[PDB]
Ligand binder design. Structure first.
Ligand SMILES: *[C@@H]1O[C@H](CO)[C@@H](O[C@@H]2O[C@H](CO)[C@@H](O)[C@H](O)[C@H]2NC(C)=O)[C@H](O)[C@H]1NC(C)=O
Ligand SMILES: *[C@@H]1O[C@H](CO)[C@@H](O[C@@H]2O[C@H](CO)[C@@H](O)[C@H](O)[C@H]2NC(C)=O)[C@H](O)[C@H]1NC(C)=O
Ligand SMILES: *[C@@H]1O[C@H](CO)[C@@H](O[C@@H]2O[C@H](CO)[C@@H](O)[C@H](O)[C@H]2NC(C)=O)[C@H](O)[C@H]1NC(C)=O
Ligand SMILES: *[C@H]1O[C@H](CO)[C@@H](O)[C@H](O)[C@H]1NC(C)=O
Ligand SMILES: *[C@H]1O[C@H](CO)[C@@H](O)[C@H](O)[C@H]1NC(C)=O
Ligand SMILES: *[C@H]1O[C@H](CO)[C@@H](O)[C@H](O)[C@H]1NC(C)=O
Lengths: 167, 329, 167, 329, 167, 329
């Protein structure tokens, strides 16, 4: 028994982010989908985009670690600094968490888009099982499966058989 | 029944990360965002650096012995050390921090004679606190002493006009003797006054004799005072004793005309670490160098240079993969 | 006549965030769906998460309300403070508004997911009416309804009846 | 036909909130984010607090009458009041704000004698401005007056080395008499000078006689001057009149060795409100205490302690439920 | 041959943001959908909402362009200023980019909602072609098309003919 | 087969914008967010403005010739110019920047006599540096000179109590003569002292004779010193020469009682641009006026007034339309 993404993930898919698992008379197989994998991987370079805000700007010493500055201005400086620190700490944590949400959401989004695309290829020849699979209502040998994976499948070629089996 | 399923990867164990909604959400992959380790060297490859050693950065201007090799330095990076002194004969600069900031970015300093000559007096006073052989003084100034022994001291003028098209850094000292015996022993007896006039600057000073705790075995002190003299402007010193006189003015190589002795703004840092000509970095702190791809750092909020942004947090994990959902049965 | 979420909300559902309303021969009923309600309610603790940024950091006085500080440093201090105020005010308004967007979006999201799940249970036994209801093309007594609500319904048990009534 | 519908709750009237896109969107439920009300008490439950009353916080150091109970205070929270005075005989501290900041965090103060003894002179000068029964002075210092009536004043030295491993807070005063008659009546005739020497500190002072507006019926003034003397270092006072001398040095309980009289950094606040041992808070302002669950506050941008962040807005509503869409017909 | 939004955009729709393109025996046409266009256009007023943060607060000079302020406090000021500049620059870029994401996402959202709405009007009378069109399985003259566009179409009126043609 | 398609617009070429995820995504339409062009005028329509011309803003207080028309100005917007001078006879204010800030927000200034009269002395000293016709002085003060020629100078008092319920701005000068011949020629011979007493303020000053570089052909200088005297409080000047006396006090129209001569806080700017009564603006800088709908500006980080927020970036494009996806075949 095989199951799609609504149920869970696939520990065995080590070749890509998204993929197809099938069952037919010839047996059972899993293959990564290259295009959607790259698509996802390509929106992942946050690290130097998080870094592309890393400054053009050079800062100098404003106080003195060896010979303490006078008390009043030392208090103003120290206060200002810890104030900027609160703010950057807050910015950094917010940026990371926003990036994290975007990354998670967009991963689901891509998986969902692949799923929708396959559903539309299959037209009236298949039904959704509720777990992220399509029950295909006609024989689909290995080559037919391949044609679903590479977006070649011609629903009209199996329509008549599939409709009969559905009804 | 023939069937095709759509699915996504998972691993047995992922990394927790935070989102907006939720905390500790598991993803296939993550990477750290906050640098926590520094290089314990000053990374000076590809820059001109000077280690000022025991020479305080203000010393470069007036020239106590420990600063002999640094009177005309050229530097992209200036390393102050923890123990440094600006002095040999004990004393302070007024506005000391402001000046340290000026030198730190100077790109190095260049000297020019001011052509003060004397004749009435001794202009070669020396102290045991400034040993360079037997006894000497601040290389860049002259201790104007009484010519005989207990002789009252002439009511002298000295004038210097800034020739260059850059600002000149002029510094002079007031000698607070250990006792009023020594004061009028080294100078005159009647009250002594020093007037220093610019176009802009105009203030005065007089000497406070009195015994202070010995520092380098001197109960005396010198107040060091400084001015930036504008291009074109002139400065007049009028004084009747207790006067430590400038001999050469300072210019900042950062304002020089495209030619040799230019440099351009330098970066002054203060550091404990050994120099290493063998690594690079653009960010420094007391422990050394922060050279890191990450965008944040939790090492030292006072790092200077071009630096990751400093944050209080030690870890901020960034998701590099989707939410991890293990395979069911 | 009954209508789903595409039309509107249910003033009468006081028991939960989401629910099922049905009609059959034995009458008309509404029941909260507990699981998806809690799911939504569980992502609501923003108040102390908005507060979890409330500082470890202690600030001291830098100026004086009783004996005014010298004018020039008092201007610098005042200016610095108002500057930080602009910034926090802006951060606070942005944080609240982002939380508000997420809360609204995620509520729709959950409602949509419950709906999708039911659609997939019903397979070919029902049709979406376009208001957030399924027209069920077989008799569905109270116990059959219950089985839709608790995700027990077995579509194959009514398929043949439903297909006949659809066609 | 049998039918099942999916739906979500709604209420008759919801609360408006703002999102990113839109303004005034109605949601089932919301909660306020910005505290707008404070407690009009100082909430001191579970902390050690001192209400300095009419005693100015600088007074604790030099000891005018109104500060008698506060010369060695121990406090986690220090409440300055609006009316306070640091003085009895009129005058100012140089760098007054800096010191206030030092005392505020001190955790309280501890006093120790400096072992100055005299003999030539009167060391018990007293004024009607410092009434403590008849006439007295700054509890913690000594007004060094001329021993007879119009006697010129000895050229005295005094020295005190900081024994402890903490910094010592030393303060002295310069006496600006009402008239040049009274000056040389209370001291000597020839110009008077005070030199104060640390390892670090070195500056001097002399007295400006002349009539000033009467303050507490005194035309005179005292300039109060202060220094932090480092562990090991020593300070020398050399003076010939017009000198108000320290008797006890100050130490800050915050730098004491784990033992009694420690405390740890305190929080100084300035406040108008009554104390209440009966409520808690870690955030204070002039109106009292902010104790609130919310994350922001609009009460006072100068609140001190551990505080909600201050924001200029009075309300920032947070959605606790979905968009409100009433039931159609 | 015509194609919907899943394929691409329509350069020739100059009249609205979203629209219907049809084919029938009477020919081929395109018409903007007013309501969903306005809906989208109405959430576009960012410029003065980005501006509604533009301050009530007045700032004064803190230093001097004509007579340079003393070095130490001039350095503190300058340092503080460049610090606030880093912060606002970062806030500005983040606000813009967030608004940009929202604008893009919400445009897709509206398009998708119009699409879902039509799908639900058509019930069993039509099948998705996978490019953002419906193949309609009965004659749909200009008036019938109009009725789809203005949300009047009554699927039951064509159901029997459409079911026959589907099977 | 009959068919219906859903679709959205597109254009041949769109504008690139940034999102969170991606950079350079093409949208149907965009608009700029960052203003980069200013108005090269000072836009003064709807406000009361004064162009101080060659009159330095501190000049309005003491009244050198170039400031004659500005001694009692009323202004909503004050335009300092680049060339301005506060002086005619050369000199500086202590705490000069602080005061500039005070005047800038003042709303203009209002003068009131302090009722000092003299009798022993000449009170009409005049210089060639303050030409107004022949030779005059600071309109608002009086150069108290020796009455004869080489006469020692009386030990004078002067007192002024602040009548009003606003603070009074009092300024006085110390005259640093070119030589000690001229000093005791224009005043007395023995050391000269000036004591200035408030309730709060209390410090003193004495004159430093000596030659300085000529400025407006004067080797002399005046130290200008100032105080804000609180409502009720009084100030006493005690002096024996070298004293440049206040004649009128200054009040800030911002503190006046609702009546004429009020104004309310003004905005001081410093600018190079011509005035234009013909355009509006609430944001200014050296190059003129920023009047713009956009929310950010990259023109000048020191712009003052009510201003777009300053940002380092020159462009931040905002999407006003959906993602652009061209039509395929
Ligand atoms: C998770 O991503 C990390 C970090 O980007 C991957 O680590 C990199 O692996 C490459 C190729 O092996 C190395 O040469 C890099 O230098 C690594 N970077 C770091 C920062 O360690 C890691 O392999 C990933 N894990 C998975 C399961 O993809
Ligand atoms: C809307 O939320 C408010 C505040 O979060 C709710 O009022 C709280 O309800 C709990 C539940 O009984 C009370 O015990 C608390 O004392 C209330 N807290 C506050 C801060 O008011 C209110 O219940 C909610 N309304 C609805 C219909 O859910
Ligand atoms: C893109 O939007 C811009 C900016 O809103 C449009 O230009 C404005 O539209 C009005 C309406 O007639 C003009 O009168 C304004 O003067 C324009 N303002 C600006 C900032 O220039 C532009 O028309 C739009 N382009 C498209 C294809 O929609
Ligand atoms: C700030 O100054 C204090 C003394 O006021 C000193 O202990 C400390 O080194 C400073 N803090 C930092 C991290 O710069
Ligand atoms: C800042 O100082 C002003 C005077 O410069 C004073 O009146 C006010 O109390 C202060 N404002 C704030 C909110 O700190
Ligand atoms: C800050 O100071 C320098 C000299 O200190 C001055 O020229 C410069 O214009 C200032 N910079 C800014 C951004 O105001």
């Amino acid at each position: 028994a095989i199951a799609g993404f609504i149920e869970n993930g696939w520990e065995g898919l080590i070749d890509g982010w998204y993929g197809f698992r099938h069952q037919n008379a010839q047996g059972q197989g899993t293959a990564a989908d290259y295009k959607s994998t790259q698509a996802a991987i390509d929106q992942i370079t946050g690290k130097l985009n998080r870094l592309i805000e890393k400054t053009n700007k050079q800062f100098e010493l404003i106080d003195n670690e060896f010979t303490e500055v006078e008390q009043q201005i030392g208090n103003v400086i120290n206060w200002t600094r810890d104030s900027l620190t609160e703010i950057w700490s807050y910015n950094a944590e917010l940026l990371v968490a926003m990036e994290n949400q975007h990354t998670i959401d967009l991963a689901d989004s891509e998986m969902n888009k692949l799923y929708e695309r396959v559903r539309r290829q299959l037209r009236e020849n298949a039904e959704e099982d509720g777990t992220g699979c399509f029950e295909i209502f006609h024989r689909c040998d290995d080559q037919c499966m391949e044609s679903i994976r590479n977006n070649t499948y011609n629903h009209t070629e199996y329509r008549q058989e599939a409709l009969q089996n559905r009804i | 029944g023939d069937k095709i399923c759509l699915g996504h990867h998972a691993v047995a164990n992922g990394t927790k990360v935070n989102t907006l909604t939720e905390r500790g959400v598991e993803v296939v992959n993550a990477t750290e965002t906050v640098e926590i380790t520094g290089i314990d060297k000053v990374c000076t490859k590809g820059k001109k650096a000077v280690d000022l050693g025991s020479c305080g950065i203000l010393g470069t201007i007036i020239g106590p012995p420990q600063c002999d090799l640094h009177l005309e330095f050229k530097a992209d990076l200036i390393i102050e050390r923890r123990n440094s002194s600006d002095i040999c004969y004990p004393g302070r600069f007024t506005n000391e921090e402001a000046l340290r900031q000026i030198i730190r970015e100077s790109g190095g300093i260049d000297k020019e004679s001011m052509g003060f000559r004397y004749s009435g007096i001794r202009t070669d006073g020396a102290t045991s606190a400034c040993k360079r052989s037997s006894s000497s003084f601040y290389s860049e100034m002259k201790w104007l002493s009484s010519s005989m022994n207990n002789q009252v001291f002439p009511q002298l003028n000295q004038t210097y006009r800034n020739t260059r098209k850059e600002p000149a850094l002029i510094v002079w000292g007031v000698h607070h003797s250990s006792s009023l015996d020594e004061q009028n022993k080294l100078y005159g007896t009647g009250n002594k006054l020093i007037t220093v006039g610019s176009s802009k600057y105009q203030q005065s000073f007089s000497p406070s004799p009195g015994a202070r705790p010995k520092v380098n075995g001197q109960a005396g002190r010198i107040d060091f005072h400084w001015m930036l003299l504008d291009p074109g402007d002139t400065v007049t010193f009028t004084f009747n004793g207790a006067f430590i006189a400038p001999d050469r003015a300072t210019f900042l190589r950062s304002n020089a005309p495209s030619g040799i002795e230019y440099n351009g703004k330098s970066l002054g840092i203060q550091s404990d670490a050994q120099i290493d000509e063998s690594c690079e970095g653009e960010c420094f702190y007391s422990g050394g160098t922060i050279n890191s791809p990450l965008p944040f750092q939790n090492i030292d909020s006072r790092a200077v240079g071009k630096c990751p942004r400093y944050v209080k947090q030690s870890s901020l994990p960034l998701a590099l993969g989707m939410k991890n959902v293990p395979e069911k049965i």
